[PDB]
Amino acid sequence: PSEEEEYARLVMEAQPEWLRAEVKRLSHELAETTREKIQAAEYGLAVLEEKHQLKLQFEELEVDYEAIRSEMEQLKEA
Amino acid sequence: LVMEAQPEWLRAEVKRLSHELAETTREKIQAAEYGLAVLEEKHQLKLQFEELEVDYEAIRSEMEQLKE
């Protein structure tokens, strides 16, 4: 029997004291994973924002580069 | 009376939490894999930014060198 059918048999045939402990155990597991899920989504928004700022900082540098390069090209007529 | 014949509620709770825990784990993993992808993207972009900085300095110093 796989671990899954063995667990299914446990739940449908174990005593209430066991069922109550599993309920408790899964409640801790779900609370912890919900905490980790939330921190992952915050991490994502933070790095998404850092990336956004970096993109603006980049495009800003692109404009400053073009201005200088534009001027230089003009100068090579002298 | 003997509503106490209630392991059917416990059993319902075990299965509810098991499913919620599975979806919360998918969402968590999915979230984490997206976080990694942004880090990868930001890394490529940081590399490109520092390239442009260098080239920017290259032609700020190559002009100014235009000196008369």
């Binding site: 992952a40 915050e42 994502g44 928004l45 998404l48 | 979230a31 942004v38």
Partner: peptide, 12 residues
Amino acid sequence: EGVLANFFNSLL
């Protein structure tokens, strides 16, 4: 990338 931020907020 608005899809990522939407997914991220939907988890909060």
